[PDB]
């Protein structure tokens, strides 16, 4: 049977297009761009134009949700594609809307919606076929209950569409696309792939998997911040695969009455077990599964015991999987993390700017945008928001846009006109207003993400960059050489040098080159962790980093431990030693198998405790020289390429007057020059209106020197007053530490072997 | 390191179950790494948390006095600086035999290098004892 093809999503928006490989097209005796007839469940026939795309595999057939509902199948299923390129032209069209799709609209679908929908689309419509058109804010379905010729016809210019009459009732086969699916979720590609991998097999082939006789996973958790669509994810997966999704809520159950919650939960279990291979979803289990010490009452312990006993009675034969969602896996009782119980754990992180872009796109899909679309800019601006945040943002932006025209339109209270809602478009001004009155949610929460610092941002130190490349990229690039020599790569690297050299910038650059996530640690954060919750935070951050390999575990202000412990304070030494011991234990427990690098940075190497100065710990210590002259201008260019400068006298001379200046004071000088330029432009403008306040329009135009171009005057003002960041004696201590490590070397000379 | 981790907080029970576990696995050998680290807290840049060090030392001495002769479990302790540590340990019925560690010398270095080279590569291009 080399004709049936496994279904796959059709990226094309066109409902009646399917992408086929050329050998399948030739084998099935099909033309180019012709129509194929597909049968699925109940031998329901659907006619679809062959789409010119061989991207999908030959065994796969691209086929979107609309045809899938037409064929009464699900994702991962098959098709019955049979040769039928002799489709006939349309004669008359008798399609009416479903009752529950145009409520509260009171408009004409034919001209407003159907006319552009069928304009040069030539969609093959068959008697009984379902086709959807997405409009100003909603999506409307239609069915070809009866047509000429029978059963299929081609959308053709000689068309007679009867869109007049009462909307059609329910056809009782559902096939409604208003529900959720895989394509309705964005920003979780990896997580979705994992869930598909570990879920599809038992559901796709239950009897076959029983014939395998191998225990499948049964306890899976998703943990993350609220409002991220975990319920959405579970519902979409269950609906797409085909199951009997069941939901249970904590508060709705625990506060029913006395101990009746036990009866309710039981009844749920045997109800689910008695229907089909299904999924049981639990929300906010921590509300009913607190910590053991947190169990101040008694009935809570009874409920937890009942739940554990009931779920553990899932002996081998069980086609039901249990999905449970909650926050961070901390408050949950540890015994639930046992085998047979919840063992698989998945995190749903906050999507990046790109993820925000897809979330906006899938949310703003229905709304008619204006021509001022800056979705990328908005996604840039909306750090600290989740999918629910973006959905609400889009909603209230739409309300702001609509509300701008209430007086002009006859508001009334009876009905609305589809033209009115079609006319309104969301403008970037509306988005700015919406963001003005907004509330980000994430805020106080650590973010994990691949950094975006590139190599040309920092000038010089190319040899050191290559050394870091060797230490970092090469072991994962060429583990074969390491195993051939049987030598273990270095665990981590430490940096020491004058501040303002952008060591963190180098860490971000190397992480971005490695294409691994970045983790930031702050000295103030560490000192906050000194008192109170100390071990738990270190343990959880280490575990999170180990989970998300490959990743870069960066540390900043590592010397801060000695800053408060050593010196004239001598008080927070206990907490500092607690933190240090915890760090040492966690890093010693780390395995070289995990692709995690520990990076510590400091500007006070002498004060550093020598405990870490041991093998297995941070041993590769790198000095950061202070760049002066040479490639300084390049660094200047790196910080000057951000904005235009055009006319300049000389950068080499600028490097000549300065000497022993880090990136910090150089960037400060650049910012000062930009500030003076802004001041000059603003004062010239203010002079222009202070001339025009008593005068008519005096041609307020670009003649204000607003182009980015720093004159020599600003540079001279900057160099008039600019203090050296580093003191020479500090350089003396840095060289003293270099000589100290030279003495620890002792031998650097050359003797012939 | 984990000794100092315990040093903040549990200092009496923890040693108790540790030595109970050691007793259960008889015969066995117990090893202590950098005992002077405890005195490093006693003598160091702070010198103020010494109550926990007192607790640890008292527990250790009490257990050593509680070690019956029938049990066959040796105890070894490595210390870089014997001077800072409390001499009260150095008494009969406790740690008594002190062994100095000489630096590797030529043939010792040659054997060490040979053992290191046992991993995979060969060094048939130089004279090890020369180095
Ligand atoms: N990645 C996403 N893609 C699409 N919609 C999303 C996404 N994340 C959140 N949403 C939207 O945000 C809302 C989240 O709804 P819901 O309360 O079910 O989510 P949740 O994160 O599972 O919440 P809960 O904490 O109650 O489990 C929905 O309107 C959903 O459409
Ligand atoms: N293009 C560049 N090249 C080198 N260093 C830079 C550049 N841009 C910024 N920097 C430096 O990066 C520093 C910020 O990183 P930071 O972690 O503060 O380093 P440090 O701790 O050494 O001050 C700034 O002080 C600045 O001197």
From Swiss-Prot, chain B:
This is Transitional endoplasmic reticulum ATPase. It is linked to Inclusion body myopathy with early-onset Paget disease with or without frontotemporal dementia 1: An autosomal dominant disease characterized by disabling muscle weakness clinically resembling to limb girdle muscular dystrophy, osteolytic bone lesions consistent with Paget disease, and premature frontotemporal dementia. Clinical features show incomplete penetrance. Necessary for the fragmentation of Golgi stacks during mitosis and for their reassembly after mitosis. Involved in the formation of the transitional endoplasmic reticulum (tER). The transfer of membranes from the endoplasmic reticulum to the Golgi apparatus occurs via 50-70 nm transition vesicles which derive from part-rough, part-smooth transitional elements of the endoplasmic reticulum (tER). Vesicle budding from the tER is an ATP-dependent process. The modification N6-acetyllysine is found at residue 124. The PIM (PUB-interaction motif) motif mediates interaction with the PUB domain of RNF31. Belongs to the AAA ATPase family. The modification N6-succinyllysine is found at residue 124. Homohexamer. Forms a ring-shaped particle of 12.5 nm diameter, that displays 6-fold radial symmetry. Part of a ternary complex containing STX5A, NSFL1C and VCP. NSFL1C forms a homotrimer that binds to one end of a VCP homohexamer. The complex binds to membranes enriched in phosphatidylethanolamine-containing lipids and promotes Golgi membrane fusion. Binds to a heterodimer of NPLOC4 and UFD1, binding to this heterodimer inhibits Golgi-membrane fusion. Interaction with VCIP135 leads to dissociation of the complex via ATP hydrolysis by VCP. It is found in: Cytoplasm, Cytosol; Endoplasmic reticulum; Nucleus; Cytoplasm, Stress granule. Phosphorylated by tyrosine kinases in response to T-cell antigen receptor activation. Phosphorylated in mitotic cells. It comes from Homo sapiens.
